[PDB]
Each structure stands twice: as structure tokens, then as C-alpha cells.
Amino acid sequence: QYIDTVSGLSDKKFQRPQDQYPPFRFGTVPNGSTERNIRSNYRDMHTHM
Amino acid sequence: TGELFFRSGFGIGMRKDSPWKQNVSLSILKSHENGFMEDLDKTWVRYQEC
Numbered sequence: 001q002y003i004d005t006v007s008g009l010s011d012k013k014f015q016r017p018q019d020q021y022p023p024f025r026f027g028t029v030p031n032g033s034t035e036r037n038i039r040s041n042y043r044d045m046h047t048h049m
Numbered sequence: 050t051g052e053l054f055f056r057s058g059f060g061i062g063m064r065k066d067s068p069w070k071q072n073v074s075l076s077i078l079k080s081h082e083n084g085f086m087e088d089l090d091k092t093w094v095r096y097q098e099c
């Protein structure tokens with residue numbers, strides 16, 4: 001079988017941002033509105049974003 | 050088996066109305082925006098190796 005096209009936000013590949021050959025993107029266009037939302041509580045993402 | 054199904058956190062524990070209840074809570078916040086605590090993880094959360 002092929003890989004599963006991983007699901008929404010809380011999927012296993014994201015909340016473990018220690019990875020360099022996963023889906024390696026978190027593009028999130030610079031200075032955008034959703035640039036702030038990823039600076040709310042959890043520095044887990046904004047560090048690899 | 051997949052992903053988590055109930056969210057929560059960790060934390061220090063202190064008897065109610067202890068004096069340090071304020072300064073302690075502070076140095077944790079400072080450590081997140083600083084980047085020390087986050088960089089600490091790799092040293093003990095090292096690679097996958099599998």
C-alpha cells in the first residue's frame with residue numbers, strides 16, 4: 001500500500017517536529033496572519049516553521 | 050498505536066501558598082522564549098535510531 005496522505009494538524013508527523021526527511025514543509029507565508037497563530041502557546045512549531 | 054486521544058501537560062509541584070510559587074513559574078516562561086529548554090530536548094530525545 002502507499003502512504004496515507006497524513007491527516008490534519010494533530011497528525012503524528014507534525015507534533016514531532018524533530019525530523020528532516022518527513023513532509024519537511026511548514027511554509028506558512030512570512031508575516032502572514034497565520035504567522036501569529038503559530039506563536040500562541042507551543043514553541044514546538046515556530047522553531048521548525 | 051496512532052496518536053494521542055487526551056491532552057495534558059507536566060509541571061512542578063509546590064505546596065499552596067509557598068513563597069517561590071511566583072519566581073519558579075517565571076523562569077519557565079523565560080526559558081521557552083529563550084530557546085534553552087527547547088534545545089535541551091535533542092540531548093535526551095536524541096535521533097530516533099530506527
Ligand SMILES: *[C@@H]1O[C@H](CO)[C@@H](O)[C@H](O)[C@H]1NC(C)=O
Pocket residue numbers: 072
Ligand atoms: C523573586 O521575585 C521577587 C519579585 O520580583 C524579588 O523581589 C525577589 O528578589 C526574587 N527572588 C526571591 C528569592 O524571591
